Design a protein around this nucleic acid. Structure first.
Lengths: 134, 184, 144, 57
RNA sequence: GGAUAGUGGCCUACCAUGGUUUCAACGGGUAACGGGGAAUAAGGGUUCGAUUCCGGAGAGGGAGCCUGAGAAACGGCUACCACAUCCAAGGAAGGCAGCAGGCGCGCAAAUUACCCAAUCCUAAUUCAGGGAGGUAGUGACAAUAAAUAACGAUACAGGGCCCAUUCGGGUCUUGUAAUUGGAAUGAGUACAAUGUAAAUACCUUAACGAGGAACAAUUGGAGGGCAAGUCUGGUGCCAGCAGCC
């Protein structure tokens, strides 16, 4: 964290999503690349808002090293951040726990099977078992 | 589907494949400006022909024509900014009379040798390719950067590389380790 | 004078006359009649697969002398018989018989090339391996 | 003579000569440099017509 | 007058004999969807346009319909023709010119992958879905920039310069090296960070990663057209080359 000098440009404050967007550029000479968590925590301790109310994404590195530019978001409160922010970005920040589902192919196969099945199907399955048994 | 991304050629081959005069001139240019192929010469000739055609179709328009005026100022100013056109003549006659040699000498690859960071144009070539060069605060590895007289003063070695400090080098570090072993 | 009408309303005459006279052009007539698709052996295509049938020692024209063999070939898509030339030194040992050969033109847009009379095509591949590769030893044809 | 045979006659009769090992040749910009010095700055043999392939006299 | 949502021979009933055509009607062909457009063009032109947009048409070939505001719909129904699937033989179902994928056909064209994060679309609709679409895999279709080395003593080849101590030194330096050097990087490996729903990719970087037997550039040629060999060995109108001579 030596001369990282994270700084902000084109600051727009929108209450429509109760936040402010900006382009955040980090000049980090003699540094490979500063991570998203470090960028967000420094942005938080710079804007005096909160650690988990700030968001960073993008951050393309200039050719040859030296600088990285990305888009930054800081929110009025962590609640509104959890409301407005996308699920994938929340899961990346760790604020949210990702849902666990199967593959899309499996989900579509399941949907096709249960669209073949009409109604609840419990009575049909019981009848099929009874007829197969005797 | 998505929109088609446009692409275009940047060079044109000569009409006659084996002309002794043309081959000798192109080899002379390649040797005295440190170019890898003749495709570079073809590319510069292509751009020169494009701008010459633009200037000619401008001149065919009458004087005080808004199109001729505006396009002449635009073309002349761009050529002056890159540095292939004179810094005191907007007569557009030189716009019909630029030269491939002028474009080559304006290219960055010879700019390093001109400003004295190379000692040889091929040393300049390998220097830019190995990115020991910064046009500004940004490192460039393109031999044909085509500077604009505003980074002429700003061409220098890359601070994130040897010959600029703060970085020993890949084999310099090996030699430093060897010297540490020898010193004990 | 000069033949052709010079009337300002003679453009129908001029267009019809040009249309009529364009049939004297060899390439225009061929393109408009579709002789490639109807009577060219390759059917308008640049290449064609075929199967080798027998041994044709074509004798060269004058003043020349070279008589070993050229492959008679039955085209797959047409069934047409076609003589093709094996294009290198000793390359006759790779085109023996009953092989599948890719055929290209000779380079004269449908004419016999040099001292070879009646041969308008050449072989480029045998069973999927280039004649050049077999000749320069970079590949060997798969017999198994 | 009946020559409808003997395909590859001289291809076989030629004596196999291995390619003599030589140092590698510079590639690309280095090749263009080599041509530049060999054609324009070298005065080794430019007397008659600036020939490029001198037969051993 | 019927029908249509409407006009209209669209169709019926009566009547007239009209309508088009060498300014090419009618017929035939198209390896013809049309246009925006593409290639090449001093000007004028020639050829191409299945294909990222627009407009048509089609869902194996016709045909007929239901529902619906909108379909003569085909991941809707019905029937005939062709093809083809499962049986216990009684009967059932089917349309990949959607996305992958297989066969066939051929000169000729990818993976039976991941995701709704983006652009949008649909629904009762912020919330679900979407092979639309995006991402990745293959991919020398084309197009952009560009690795393959750069600098040094001396043995050897010579394009510019100096005392009247006339084959003596070389202040300024052009090229291989068979006696060589404290030097620069990428290609490729990487716990890393970043990009991405999450990662191989790029951009940034630990560390590793050159000395020429190696990290080695080919493809075509050397009579002319068209620069580049009357150099060696072999063959000997043979083999073969040769776009033309």
């Amino acid at each position: 964290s030596d001369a990282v000098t994270i700084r902000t440009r084109k600051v727009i404050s929108n209450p429509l999503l109760a936040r402010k967007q900006f382009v955040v550029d980090v000049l980090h000479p003699n540094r490979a690349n500063v991570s998203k968590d470090e960028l967000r925590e420094k942005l938080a301790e710079v804007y005096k808002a909160e650690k988990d109310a700030v968001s960073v994404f993008g951050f393309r590195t200039q050719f040859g090293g030296g600088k990285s530019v990305g888009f930054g978001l800081v929110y009025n409160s962590v609640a509104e951040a959890k409301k407005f922010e996308p699920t994938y970005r929340l899961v990346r920040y760790g604020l949210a726990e990702k849902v666990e589902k199967a593959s899309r192919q499996q989900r579509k196969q399941k949907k096709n099977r249960d669209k073949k099945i009409f109604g609840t199907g419990k009575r049909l399955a019981k009848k099929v078992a009874r007829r197969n048994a005797d | 589907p998505r929109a088609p991304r446009t692409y275009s050629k940047t060079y044109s081959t000569p009409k006659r494949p084996y002309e002794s005069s043309r081959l000798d001139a192109e080899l002379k240019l390649a040797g005295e400006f440190g170019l890898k192929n003749k495709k570079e010469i073809y590319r510069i000739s292509f751009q020169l022909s494009k701008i010459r055609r633009a200037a000619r179709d401008l001149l065919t328009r009458d004087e005080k024509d808004p199109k001729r005026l505006f396009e002449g100022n635009a073309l002349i100013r761009r050529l002056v900014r890159v540095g292939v056109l004179s810094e005191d003549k907007k007569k557009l006659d030189y716009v019909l009379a630029l030269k491939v040699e002028d474009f080559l000498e304006r290219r960055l690859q010879t700019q390093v040798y001109k400003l004295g960071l190379a000692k040889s144009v091929h040393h300049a070539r390998v220097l830019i390719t190995q990115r020991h060069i910064a046009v500004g605060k940004q490192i460039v590895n393109i031999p044909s950067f085509m500077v604009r007289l505003d980074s002429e003063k700003h061409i220098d070695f890359a601070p994130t590389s040897p010959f600029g400090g703060a970085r020993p080098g890949r084999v310099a570090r090996r030699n430093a380790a060897r010297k540490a072993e020898a010193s004990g | 004078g000069k033949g052709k009408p010079r009337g300002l309303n003679s453009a129908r005459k001029l267009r019809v006359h040009r249309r009529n006279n364009r049939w004297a052009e060899n390439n225009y007539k061929k393109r408009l009649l579709g002789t490639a698709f109807k009577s060219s052996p390759f059917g308008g295509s640049s290449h064609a697969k075929g199967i080798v049938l027998e041994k044709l020692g074509i004798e060269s024209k004058q003043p020349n002398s070279a008589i070993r063999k050229c492959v008679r070939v039955q085209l797959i898509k047409n069934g047409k018989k076609v003589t093709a030339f094996v294009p290198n030194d000793g390359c006759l040992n790779f085109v023996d018989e009953n092989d599948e050969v890719l055929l290209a033109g000779f380079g004269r847009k449908g004419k016999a090339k040099g001292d070879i009379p009646g041969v308008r095509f050449k072989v480029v591949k045998v069973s999927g391996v280039s004649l050049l590769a077999l000749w320069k030893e970079k590949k060997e044809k798969p017999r198994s | 003579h009946g020559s409808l045979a003997r395909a590859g006659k001289v291809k076989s009769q030629t004596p196999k000569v291995e390619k003599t090992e030589k140092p590698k040749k510079p590639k690309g910009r280095a090749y263009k440099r080599l041509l530049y010095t060999r054609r324009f700055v070298n005065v080794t043999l430019v007397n008659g017509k600036r020939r490029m392939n001198p037969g051993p006299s």
